[PDB]
């Protein structure tokens, strides 16, 4: 998270460090993620920062997308296992929209617009569907 804050500070400064520096930062992200898992929202912030400062290396984008997706699927699996354990022991339109938005924000830790723009960026970079 300190490295994420460093990248955000550099993005605010509108100054682009060398490419090898950002590659080293991404490799440190990869190494340090085991001891302390990186959140989905900081991963999104780092993804936006790295994309804005012209970091061509696709490996960091792959790693950040993996970090987002692992958290999303872990949360989904957690809710599904809670439901399975429970079953083993055993305007309305506006309200439904609000409940769906709350559920999506709880699962993905991100607003739907930012998730969709992440998907659009991945599509532009040629990732598989």
């Amino acid at each position: 998270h300190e490295l994420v804050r460093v990248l955000t500070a550099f993005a605010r400064a509108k100054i682009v460090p060398p490419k090898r520096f950002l590659a080293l930062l991404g490799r440190r992200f990869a190494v340090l993620n085991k001891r302390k898992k990186l959140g989905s929202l900081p991963s999104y912030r780092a993804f936006v920062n790295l994309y804005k400062m012209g970091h061509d290396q696709m490996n960091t984008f792959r790693f950040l997308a993996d970090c987002i997706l692992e958290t999303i699927d872990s949360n989904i699996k957690a809710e599904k296992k809670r439901l399975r354990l429970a079953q083993l022991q055993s305007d309305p339109h506006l309200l439904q929209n609000l409940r769906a938005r709350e559920r999506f924000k709880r699962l993905t830790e991100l607003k739907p617009s930012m998730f969709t723009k992440l998907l659009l960026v991945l599509a532009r970079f040629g990732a598989p569907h």
Binding site: A23, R27, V31, N33, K34, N59, F63
Partner: protein, 436 residues
Amino acid sequence: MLLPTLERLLERCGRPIFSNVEDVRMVMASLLDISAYVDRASTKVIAKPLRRFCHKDPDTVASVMEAVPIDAAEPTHGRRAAMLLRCLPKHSCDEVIWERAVAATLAGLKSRKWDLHDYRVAMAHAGRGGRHAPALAAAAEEFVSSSARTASQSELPALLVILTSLPELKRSPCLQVAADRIVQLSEILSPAAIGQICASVNKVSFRHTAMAIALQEEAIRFAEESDLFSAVQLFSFICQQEKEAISPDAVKCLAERVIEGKDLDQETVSVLCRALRSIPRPHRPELLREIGEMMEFLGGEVKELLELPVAKGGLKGDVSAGDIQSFISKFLSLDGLLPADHDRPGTYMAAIVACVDYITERLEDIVSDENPPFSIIPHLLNINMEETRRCGQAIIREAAEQGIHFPTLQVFRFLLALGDHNMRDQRVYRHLRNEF
């Protein structure tokens, strides 16, 4: 009578005591002028500080050269043209001074008035960069030729060190001429110089069968007279030769000589590993005993180096991934030499356990490098030992832990290894499935 005072000043000038640029310039100019009137014993005494200064301040070297021009009409000037080439840094030196030194060296070679030792000291460092004037070697192709038929046993290394200075010299027929002259003096041996000859000629892959037969003919003499460095260089050059030239009985004496070398640099260990790897297959069945006995103490030496601290030449704090990967890869390819059913020489598997536990104690940082030694994974897995496959499993698991993206061919090869050795880890399974 100025030798003690000048040597004391040379020792003292290494530290940054003089705080003036002009003082430094004048001291460098005086040293360059006075290096022409000292013996070879004090040569390094001039070279070591100047080189450091040349490493510290390569820019002032241009002004020093302007103050002290090079003249090829005096023998004493040879050291002047020999030290500076060593003094100038290999990669952090400007182009102008290098080109000027190249022109001065070409003029000195055209003069032919200098001393052969001066030619050695000059060219052995002029061949470090070789960035400009590609005709040098071609011009050198004549400089050696005039001395091709006159170099004695103690003068052949002088010409050969020059002959191996440039890549453009890898196709020089003067190497063949030197081989013919070695044939002329085949029986006449110099144990201190034959090692230098072998160390010079190993760079070029050229093979002259008759000369190698001549060198291995008198291995009885080389059992005592030849030193350890000469022994290892001669053994490498001999095994590198063709199958017809290699004498199976003669190469045994060199191997017996190299036994019990005690303190050996890791570079010569790698050289011995390559030497064992470069033995023709038909000769291996008759020399399994030699490979095994070399194996026995090679394992002990590499284990000692792994335990030895980096300061004394070990790998306790080793960080060069590209170096450890090559060292261990050569070590395990040396294991690949032996037959699968053949029982491994004793106390070698102890060195294997030392290698694997050392490579497992540092796992995150090794993979953290820009080019992690993923290519060492097959080398580990080609060995029929539980520990090797376990270490490969651990390496692939760590790689999964970082979630490093893999090329599809590497994914397929890792899956093939997974199927081949029937590993039962799950995190590796999930990551490999995702990557595929």
